[PDB]
Amino acid sequence: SGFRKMAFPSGKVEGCMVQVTCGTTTLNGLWLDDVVYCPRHVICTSEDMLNPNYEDLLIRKSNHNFLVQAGNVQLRVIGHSMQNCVLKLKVDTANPKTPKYKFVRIQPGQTFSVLACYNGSPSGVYQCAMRPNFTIKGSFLNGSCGSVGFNIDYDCVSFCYMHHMELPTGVHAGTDLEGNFYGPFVDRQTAQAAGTDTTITVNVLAWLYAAVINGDRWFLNRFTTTLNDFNLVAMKYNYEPLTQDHVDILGPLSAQTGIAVLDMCASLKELLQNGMNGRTILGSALLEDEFTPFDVVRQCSGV
Amino acid sequence: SGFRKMAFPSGKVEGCMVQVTCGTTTLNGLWLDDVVYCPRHVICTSEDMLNPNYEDLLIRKSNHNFLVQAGNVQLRVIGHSMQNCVLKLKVDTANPKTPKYKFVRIQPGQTFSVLACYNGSPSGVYQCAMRPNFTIKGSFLNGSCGSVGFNIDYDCVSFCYMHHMELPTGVHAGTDLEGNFYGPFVDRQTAQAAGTDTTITVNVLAWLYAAVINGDRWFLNRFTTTLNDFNLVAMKYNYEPLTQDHVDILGPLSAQTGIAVLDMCASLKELLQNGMNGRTILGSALLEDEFTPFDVVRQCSGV
Numbered sequence: 001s002g003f004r005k006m007a008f009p010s011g012k013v014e015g016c017m018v019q020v021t022c023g024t025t026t027l028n029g030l031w032l033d034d035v036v037y038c039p040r041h042v043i044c045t046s047e048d049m050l051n052p053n054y055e056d057l058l059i060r061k062s063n064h065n066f067l068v069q070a071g072n073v074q075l076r077v078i079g080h081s082m083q084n085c086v087l088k089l090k091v092d093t094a095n096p097k098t099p100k101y102k103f104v105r106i107q108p109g110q111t112f113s114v115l116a117c118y119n120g121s122p123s124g125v126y127q128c129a130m131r132p133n134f135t136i137k138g139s140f141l142n143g144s145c146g147s148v149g150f151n152i153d154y155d156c157v158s159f160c161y162m163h164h165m166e167l168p169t170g171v172h173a174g175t176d177l178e179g180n181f182y183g184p185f186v187d188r189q190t191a192q193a194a195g196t197d198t199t200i201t202v203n204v205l206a207w208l209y210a211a212v213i214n215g216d217r218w219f220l221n222r223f224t225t226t227l228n229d230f231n232l233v234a235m236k237y238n239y240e241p242l243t244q245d246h247v248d249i250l251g252p253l254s255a256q257t258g259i260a261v262l263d264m265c266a267s268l269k270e271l272l273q274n275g276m277n278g279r280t281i282l283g284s285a286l287l288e289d290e291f292t293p294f295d296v297v298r299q300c301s302g303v
Numbered sequence: 304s305g306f307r308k309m310a311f312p313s314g315k316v317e318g319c320m321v322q323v324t325c326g327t328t329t330l331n332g333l334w335l336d337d338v339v340y341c342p343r344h345v346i347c348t349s350e351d352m353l354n355p356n357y358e359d360l361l362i363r364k365s366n367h368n369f370l371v372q373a374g375n376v377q378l379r380v381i382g383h384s385m386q387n388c389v390l391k392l393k394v395d396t397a398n399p400k401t402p403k404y405k406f407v408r409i410q411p412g413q414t415f416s417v418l419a420c421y422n423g424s425p426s427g428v429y430q431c432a433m434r435p436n437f438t439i440k441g442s443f444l445n446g447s448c449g450s451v452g453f454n455i456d457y458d459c460v461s462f463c464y465m466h467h468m469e470l471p472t473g474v475h476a477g478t479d480l481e482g483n484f485y486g487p488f489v490d491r492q493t494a495q496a497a498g499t500d501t502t503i504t505v506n507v508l509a510w511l512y513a514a515v516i517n518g519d520r521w522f523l524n525r526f527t528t529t530l531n532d533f534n535l536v537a538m539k540y541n542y543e544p545l546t547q548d549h550v551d552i553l554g555p556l557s558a559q560t561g562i563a564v565l566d567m568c569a570s571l572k573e574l575l576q577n578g579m580n581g582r583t584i585l586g587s588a589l590l591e592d593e594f595t596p597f598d599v600v601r602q603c604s605g606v
């Protein structure tokens with residue numbers, strides 16, 4: 001028993017982290033085979049933060065402008081290119097620690113582990129969800145760029161996030177590993193706003209099932225609702241619409257607990273309209289939406 | 304900026320996990336140099352559970368009754384001994400991945416990272432605190448015994464916890480790596496109940512400082528209190544007494560924010576007496592007590 005915000009074991013990714021310096025700017029790089037991936041804004045100066053044209057800063061760079069350090073071993077850069085908002089630095093050594101890996105782009109509402117690093121050295125690991133507005137609520141300080149997000153399936157690391165920036169609201173924005181930003185953000189010093197966020201309804205339901213599996217039952221009731229009547233309540237509270245595919249995805253948790261999805265929806269509607277009246281669910285006084293149905297099944301395997 | 308429950312990178316410990324089987328019972332072991340450490344209840348059977356004489360059970364075992372597997376490689380057990388509630392299995396191979404390490408026993412109120420494992424294979428990593436009643440609120444299923452808790456300083460792994468059991472309340476109990484239980488628990492079958500828990504006051508104050516560092520300021524006030532008057536309120540709400548050493552430990556966070564410790568205590572008193580009136584702090588509607596002052600400093604480093 002127990003339910004915790006759990007990250008994937010980070011060992012396979014730790015072996016991929018290097019330090020990339022260009023000018024007086026240092027950040028993190030991801031070393032896979034003979035390529036190091038890093039945010040392209042490593043080539044920017046104090047003087048070009050509002051109007052940066054990145055082909056040219058790049059055209060004006062040479063291979064020797066990039067110092068790549070793996071531990072205390074210097075890697076020789078033998079080629080450089082831009083891929084959207086990331087740089088690909090070809091180095092003269094394939095990383096012997098390269099895991100089996102994939103570059104996947106994730107969907108809002110999906111979760112991943114972040115390995116926070118500074119100067120190529122990992123600091124900590126934690127779980128994040130991609131918000132409906134394509135930001136993430138992380139923990140990132142100056143020097144955290146090149147910190148990657150990932151999932152692991154058996155021995156294959158699916159990289160999904162590279163960190164680039166913090167917004168004025170304190171939330172975080174980045175790219176997939178092809179260098180394409182999540183959301184309407186750009187790698188400039190512009191104060192940018194994300195759109196309005198919403199709550200990931202299917203995840204809240206999954207976490208309620210986690211609660212039941214773990215013995216928290218006080219919020220259950222006889223009642224059931226229709227999908228239509230639930231979604232009318234959901235939109236009033238800034239919750240995302242629940243689709244039939246969401247209902248289907250919750251099937252296995254529904255079967256394990258014997259609580260029909262639309263029954264659990266009736267509990268959620270009451271929680272939304274009444275609050276908790278001083279009680280907690282799995283140690284929380286708020287409704288939690290950063291656990292996917294997969295996250296619950298993986299962790300609550302067998303109770 | 305940002306504040307998350309963050310675990311240490313788990314790579315160094317992943318390289319130490321093995322699978323230990325004796326009879327029909329499989330659990331995890333910790334392989335350091337030429338010794339594998341595991342819970343001694345691996346040698347118990349279905350019908351000796353309520354009070355095994357472990358020491359009778361061990362004299363009846365031989366080296367070949369213990370099968371140890373590191374990945375896909377069987378390790379030969381060449382010796383076995385009991386140290387309190389753990390077993391030391393001497394193997395014929397020193398683990399080439401052994402980090403610099405220490406066996407430390409932690410205090411209630413301190414935190415550590417848990418690498419949850421099954422069949423010698425790591426599943427996830429998360430942060431735990433040792434409760435004042437010597438339990439931990441973890442996520443542990445059947446097969447997770449022998450999973451370890453640890454902190455990392457520089458590149459030295461300080462192991463502090465090995466998992467043994469779940470209490471009827473759903474919380475978890477284990478030993479240090481010398482096999483001595485945290486708290487009044489035994490690796491046998493009784494009606495084991497935790498003693499009454501309390502909230503870790505110094506940690507709540509540390510987390511309030513993290514909140515300020517991260518721009519959550521609504522709970523601040525212009526009052527200050529005396530340590531005596533605060534501790535009278537703390538005792539009323541099941542909070543641990545705040546000592547002058549606690550105030551001293553909070554010094555650096557006090558200086559960084561310019562909020563004197565006893566001023567922050569005045570905010571905490573009002574939070575305890577009024578609640579939050581529907582507001583949140585660092586995304587929480589409850590007062591969080593599983594971040595130490597060190598956890599905050601290390602993460603809210605330089606704003």
Ligand SMILES: *C(=O)[C@H](C[C@@H]1CCCNC1=O)NC(=O)[C@H](CC(C)C)NC(=O)[C@H](Cc1ccccc1)NC(=O)/C=C/c1ccccc1
Pocket residue numbers: 027041044049140141142143144145164165166167168172186187188189190191192304
């Ligand atoms: C890379 O390591 C770094 C990480 C972020 C910086 C520190 C805070 N948390 C982080 O994750 N990424 C950047 O520095 C990035 C470089 C750009 C994309 C070229 N910039 C930022 O993240 C933010 C964007 C921003 C700009 C203006 C307002 C609000 C957000 N830049 C800053 O935070 C700097 C703000 C600043 C500096 C000096 C004086 C006043 C304000």
Ligand SMILES: *C(=O)[C@H](C[C@@H]1CCCNC1=O)NC(=O)[C@H](CC(C)C)NC(=O)[C@H](Cc1ccccc1)NC(=O)/C=C/c1ccccc1
Pocket residue numbers: 001330344347352443444445446447448449467468469470471475489490491492493
């Ligand atoms: C080792 O892997 C295992 C992990 C725990 C078991 C599964 C639940 N979560 C865990 O962390 N540790 C044990 O199995 C341990 C072995 C003892 C110490 C020799 N036992 C337990 O953790 C609990 C103790 C307990 C016993 C009775 C009531 C409450 C708690 N044992 C059980 O959970 C088994 C309960 C049970 C089994 C079969 C029928 C009815 C109840």
